[PDB]
Amino acid sequence: XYXXXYX
Amino acid sequence: XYXXXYX
Amino acid sequence: SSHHHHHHSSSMNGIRWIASYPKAGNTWVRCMLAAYITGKAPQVWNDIDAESLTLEAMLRFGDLPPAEPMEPVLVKTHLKADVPVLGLYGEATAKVLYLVRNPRDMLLSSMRMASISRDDVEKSRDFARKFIANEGLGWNALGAGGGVGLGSWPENVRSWTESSSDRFPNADVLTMRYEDLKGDPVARFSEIVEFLDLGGPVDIEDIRRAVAASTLERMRELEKRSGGSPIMMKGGPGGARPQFVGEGRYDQSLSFLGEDIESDYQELLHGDSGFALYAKQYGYAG
Amino acid sequence: MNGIRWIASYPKAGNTWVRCMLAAYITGKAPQVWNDIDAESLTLEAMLRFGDLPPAEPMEPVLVKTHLKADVPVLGLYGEATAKVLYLVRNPRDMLLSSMRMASISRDDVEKSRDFARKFIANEGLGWNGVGLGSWPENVRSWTESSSDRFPNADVLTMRYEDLKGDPVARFSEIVEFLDLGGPVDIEDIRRAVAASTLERMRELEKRSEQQGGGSPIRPQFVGEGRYDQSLSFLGEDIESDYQELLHGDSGFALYAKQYGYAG
Ligand SMILES: [Cl-]
Secondary structure, X not given: OOOXXXX | OOOOXXX | OOOOEEOOOOOOOEEEEEEEOOOOOHHHHHHHHHHHHHOOOOOOHHHHHOOOEEHHHHHOOOOOOOOOOOOEEEEEEOOOOOOOOHHHHOOOEEEEEEEEOOHHXXXXXXXXXXXXXXXXXXXXXXXXXXXXHHOOOOOOOOOHHHOOOOOOHHHHHHHHHOOHHHHOOOOEEEEEXXXXXXXXXXXXXXXXXXXHOOOXXXXXXXXXHHHHOOOHHHHHHHHHHOOOOOOOOOOOHHHOOOOOOOOOOOOOOOHHHOHHHXXXXXXXXXOXXXXXXXXXXOOOOO | OOEEEEEEEOOOOOHHHHHHHHHHHHHOOOOOOHHHHHOOOEEHHHHHOOOOOOOOOOOOEEXXXXXXXXXXXXXXXXXXXXXXXXXXXXXXXXXXXXXXXXXXXXXXXXXXXXXXXXXXXXXXXXXXXXXXXXXXXXXXXXXXXXXXXXXXXOEEEEEEHHHXXXXXXXXXXXXXXXXXXXXXXXXXXXXXXXXXXXXXXXXXXXXXHHHHOOOOOOOOOOOOOOOOOOOOHHHOHHXXXXXXXXXXXXXXXXXXXXXXXXXX
């Protein structure tokens, strides 16, 4: 886990 | 708050 | 190719004490030490813990720092220097690094970590007045050192910074203000590293990188990313925990709790207690 | 004889019970609140929390409770000063369930109770919750064997919770005689200390303590029923079966389970 982004 | 993400 | 979205998850050998009263920036310094020692940016809490021991954590398992180390050994504690466990290290101690910070800011930091929001007027007022009444956090029977082992702020400060030739005859002692580190992290951290004498020339470039690896921003990422702990993302309400890496502010006013609290605090600062003496000595009394 | 008397055990093995009986015996007063028990014997882990430690050169018999393995560095300080080790053992089935109850996990919460049992089984103990305990076999071994090494000046006695339960007076008398608390041991006072410490008295002690806040044993009730060899079938047969597998091998867990009559 640990997200997040911003794409 | 205090927990994170993102969903 | 649309941007701006969020992901949907649903003596050269010997003990070096990194000692401080709670909330004085101990973890930040240990983060900079880990970054500096390893030449790598810590990514999770365990990377920080891998390069310095925590006495209280060790004690929880009946573990102890080596009494005759063949290397520099970094150990964090918040315990007063005169607790019986520390007396085992009278001779083995080579360095004391004592970190001090404005009690206003320790107060507010501790309050947050106690899950008391500034929105909770009653709890925050209660907390702040207890802090003032007790000259620190040694009232909290549930906190570090069971309160008693921590002492009040002046008791803790006195134990670590005074009569050091008696308690730790073979050690050098350096006291460093959190605020001075904030002011010039590279210069002050390089003084910490030189003082701890972990071996060899302090490379200012290594210092700069270690500081860059341990900024509030990097440490916020570390907290979110972790991994270990500072002491399973998005459970329910009850799964929330206070933010360990906050804003690192200086000389915060207590007025928002009520001007009377701020006034009570000032009363304390300018009185004749050991608290006031140390606040003056470290430039926290105005 | 001067020196530390360890009251050592893996968690939930009837340690507080023995400490209560000891307090009653030493003082000749029926303990009324937790503080009456804690007044008579130190707890290593509680002391460490303050950075405090039992005296390394005791000038009197000193009782100290610990759940830590005998081989952790802190216990290493007491190699010379240790005079007696009393080690209490109890059926791990029952330690498991007692521990589960005290962690406020309900028997019908399928996922949490199952997860807890699995971890107990996978880890052969409660040393994951901390590593200072060790697994049950590690703890048992640390305290009951190579005592000539760890505590060269000490005698060692191991007692089963279950034998204490079966004949409190005979067994506690043996404990008191072993601990050497000064003077001949009067059976009448063993009997009186046992009576002051029955389950009923201790439930009363628990209630009384709660109305006065007269201490705390460490909300789940600390004084339960003291059941023996409880089935884990309710958690599921795979789990009971996984547990039995532990008993049926030649690991340290199996060895000590057999040795203390817990292997069925
Ligand atoms: Cl997504």
